[PDB]
Amino acid sequence: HHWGYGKHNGPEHWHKDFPIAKGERQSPVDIDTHTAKYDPSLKPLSVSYDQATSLRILNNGHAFNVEFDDSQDKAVLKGGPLDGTYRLIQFHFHWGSLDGQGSEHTVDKKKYAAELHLVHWNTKYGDFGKAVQQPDGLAVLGIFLKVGSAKPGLQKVVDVLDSIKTKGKSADFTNFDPRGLLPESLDYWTYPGSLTTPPLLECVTWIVLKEPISVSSEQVLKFRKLNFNGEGEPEELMVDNWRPAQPLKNRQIKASFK
Template identity: 45%
Template sequence: MEKWGYGGDNGPSMWHIVEGGAYPVAVEGNRQSPIDVQTNKVEVCDELGELKYMYDPKNCMSVENTGSSWKVNVNSDGSRIDALLSCIKKPREKTNLSGGPLGNDKYQLAQFHAHWGGENGRGSEHTVDGKMFSAELHLVHYNVKYGSFGEAADKPDGLAVLGMLIKVGAEHAEFGKLCDLLRKIPKKGDKVDICAPMDPANFLPRNKSYYTYEGSLTTPPLFESVTWILFKQPIEVSQAQIRFMRDLKFGDDHSERMCDNYRPPCPLKGRVVRTPKWL
């Protein structure tokens, strides 16, 4: 059983040697994530275009406590329920992401989750000029040419993640829908169906300017397969809303509250961070 986590004996600094499943790529890899975006070294590129995305709110199926975060499961690669629905009405629309650094490849949303700190001012995985935010939201997509998330997960162009930095401020309407569900999954393994539609597009900031670079998953197995698209404009959630995340547990009722579940920035190792010229 894998024993990685966020504690002193199994946290990110130990992932390359952690008991029960070491991940040497954590220190040996050349495109590990997250990173600190140094804005004075970002390359401005003419060829980077606008992102194109389409999400169907009905595709958000369930939310679960994974023991390291909450995770919204998105129906993205077809399922038996879609086959049944197609017999009686129009089936669910596929979710997809393209454009920007992804070119003409299409990526489907598979899940989204977050990382956060125990107090405001820390918790994001990516930092900008050394500045950390209170949390970070990740929308995880896979390249449809590989057929499934599992097949795409370890390919160099297999995944694309939209990252949103989160600061504490105004209440967030779409995040509020999620908070209503988080109170129902306090312990690891808890899971609840999503009944009311939840629109992933409503989590994106108004300004779509972004940084992009080649990176990895930020949790084991740390596959170096992610095209990262990190929005420059943070989104806001209220103090009460972020508390719902901090009230989750890493394990059962007697375990610690789920806080500081983030990986610190990794060395850039010669990679280039780019941004569109037109934004």
Template identity: 40%
Template sequence: MALPALVLCCLALLAQDILASGGGGPSWTYTGQHGPSNWGSMFRECAGKRQSPINIETGNVKTEYWRPFTLKNYDQPPTRMRIKNNGHSAVVEMDAPSAPRVSQGGLKGEYIFAQYHFHWGGDSSLGSEHTIDGVRYPMELHMVHYKASYGSLGSAVAKPDGLAVLGVMLEISGTDNPALTPLVSALRNITDSGMFADVAANYPLRAFLPRNLEKFYRYEGSLTTPTCNEVVTWTVFADAIPVSEKQMEFFRSLKNDNGGAMVNNFRPPQPLNSRKVMVSAESGADSASMKKVGLTLYFMTSMAVLMMNM
């Protein structure tokens, strides 16, 4: 059922408040005494055993055979987009006739889009929250969704499987990314914390995802900002999308809550502990079917050989 634009607007604002404000607790930063190394003492769950981000070791992952993602309304341009400087990131909210939803891809249920935001570095040698074999990208985009069956974001953040976040790496390109250009232009109007601006061109969510959605990494984790709720099913795509150095500079021109440069707004990788990271097989349901067929053929062939030798 389509959600009215006003409802989506309220959901986006609620998402921003819950995911970026620290839930009304003590103030936090990315540096100094209120930085990531002290979040665990400021917010109990930030010291948990299922924290994010992590370093993804590609040689130590388990292959899983999942159906391809089903993306609903991801190709439908929103009726309105806004970008806000919340003091920690640039957060994009949108209104749409029908809420974008994601399911399959190993997710247990359908999840409704709430907002997306970015993490970036002071230069292009760092910036992403997740690392892959220790490698950092200059920027990482997070598309936040809440589980539809829980009815609201507020209810979902209290459930172990309440949120699904799609993580997209950005890599430096010699040319601008057209989908990012309207966002970058709007950044000029939100340099200070608390400011927001409309985005001139409304690109659909699909424009911010890599072309190849088949290969991705999956693990159970948390929000990467306080209060670090351990409620997130993480998807980190293997392929990146482009961004130019010129576009990156506009993100780096934003100011944080203290009036300083908003750069290096990422949390360092957290211990994996007993969790397992999985990687998708790159042909989705077909791979699963072929695996089953292969096992069946192997069994039949083995039986035939055995009978011939009797």
């Protein structure tokens, strides 16, 4: 009886195995755009993905992860609200059973169809597992997806999904360029938060881009054909793998714009 996205083991249950679920800096949150403070001291975000080395894609039973070589300083995030350098380790998405829901963060209570998370760890901690034990260990770049035009840069991810349909499947996935998933503007909101799945650790500086990317209906339909179950188990479609907005508590969301 492990955690998941149901009935009986979904977000509303996670606190019993992971009591930090009711902590003081949990994510995601609703971004109330009127009460986010513009902060002129924030810097432009610096995304340097020109040497990124993707390796593999994995269905982990909750989502799929596209994983990167993070053994050298090759795909890094810095600037923005960050001190120091953060190295890309993986990206993944959260999405819905319908186009009207699927994002984790919301904007004035608006849900997007999905949300991409590019996960980076602070190099001052040497590796991901030590970084998640620190309050400034990770920086997660979150990007909303709406359904409209296709995203050509997403298609190579969509096409490999039938090879990793069920939990525990992986496939070679080299030469994937995550620059092809970025919108045109890097204007962002930022606040201190947490991983949005167990272990729910309070180690993340969240950076949420204002401008969503568009993906097609056919692209998001292929996400919804994945499965949470393993091969030879009854089919449980991988949909609605998002945690709802959590209490903001004693936190300020800052805007890099306006």
